[PDB]
């Protein structure tokens with residue numbers, strides 16, 4: 001019965017086979033999400049984001065009257081935006097153009113309407129009373145976006161707003177226990193367990209997670225892994241995250257902890273090449289400079305038939321721009337031919353770039369008719385290392 005463990009993990013199910021067999025599970029898992037309610041919450045968060053932007057710009061002395069025109073550079077110097085925050089500032093201006101306050105003409109901006117009096121803290125509280133299940137999202141958005149002017153002026157390190165040493169759980173709850181993240185993280189767990197269901201007893205499985213953070217996605221996977229034949233490598237670029245995850249996950253003795261910067265050759269950071277069966281990357285790969293070189297490093301870690309499980313957001317979101325868009329990773333991208341002005345890719349763009357970086361049999365999840373629009377704005381992508 002035993003066959004050499006040195007040979008590639010051919011027992012791994014194809015991603016397409018995995019999605020076919022998970023189809024009845026995914027159909028019922030999607031229905032657990034309120035379609036009408038998740039949409040109206042998301043819509044209101046996008047409107048509240050406009051009020052945070054206007055409040056911050058007025059705090060920096062925005063005095064642009066209607067008809068007046070300005071370019072990005074002049075407005076940044078006027079408001080005092082530091083050079084490292086201009087790309088975020090440009091996106092904020094783009095948001096104001098989407099709602100009709102501004103208009104984009106060539107590389108110029110024209111003020112169409114005078115922004116009215118806003119009080120986003122008061123409206124955030126009203127939404128908190130109506131949707132207490134979104135308290136983590138509202139509280140994080142209030143803590144981050146209410147210091148938008150200080151971040152734009154380089155006076156406040158936005159990592160101390162998103163990921164302060166004393167509160168890493170708030171941002172974790174967004175990645176872990178939000179309505180949409182509950183579904184996506186469950187898909188991540190079901191995919192991984194289904195792909196390895198034919199694991200021979202005489203063989204161990206090696207999983208590596210990139211950008212695992214505090215372990216929001218990780219917590220869904222660990223309880224289902226067989227500790228006797230699993231090695232799970234928990235990695236993040238930052239040791240503060242692996243340190244916090246090591247405390248949370250003490251019960252699991254098959255976990256290893258190590259730092260990994262996916263933008264640099266992993267084999268120079270103490271990782272074996274082509275020796276991991278499953279790589280998990282939840283909400284991280286977008287925060288890199290070049291997706292092709294990031295995906296080539298990801299592919300470099302996968303065994304010849306290994307599985308890449310990707311969890312990414314696929315659409316622009318105003319309130320996300322006021323939280324994780326404050327951080328440097330949101331604006332690292334320079335592959336402008338692929339990503340002209342935003343770090344995220346949609347389903348079709350991910351499939352194309354994966355097929356160009358050595359991945360095959362690419363599946364995007366979930367794909368159910370009658371699906372809530374919120375589930376269309378994020379995806380779990382499963383792809384196989386090709387050769």
Ligand SMILES: Nc1ncnc2c1ncn2[C@@H]1O[C@H](CSCC[C@H](N)C(=O)O)[C@@H](O)[C@H]1O
Pocket residue numbers: 172175176210211212213214215216217218236237238241260261262263282283284287288329
């Ligand atoms: N270049 C890089 N290589 C590896 N990890 C990176 C990275 N740039 C940012 N990261 C990490 O990616 C993480 C994104 S937080 C993503 C959510 C996380 N998977 C969870 O569920 O909790 C951050 O913790 C950050 O430290």
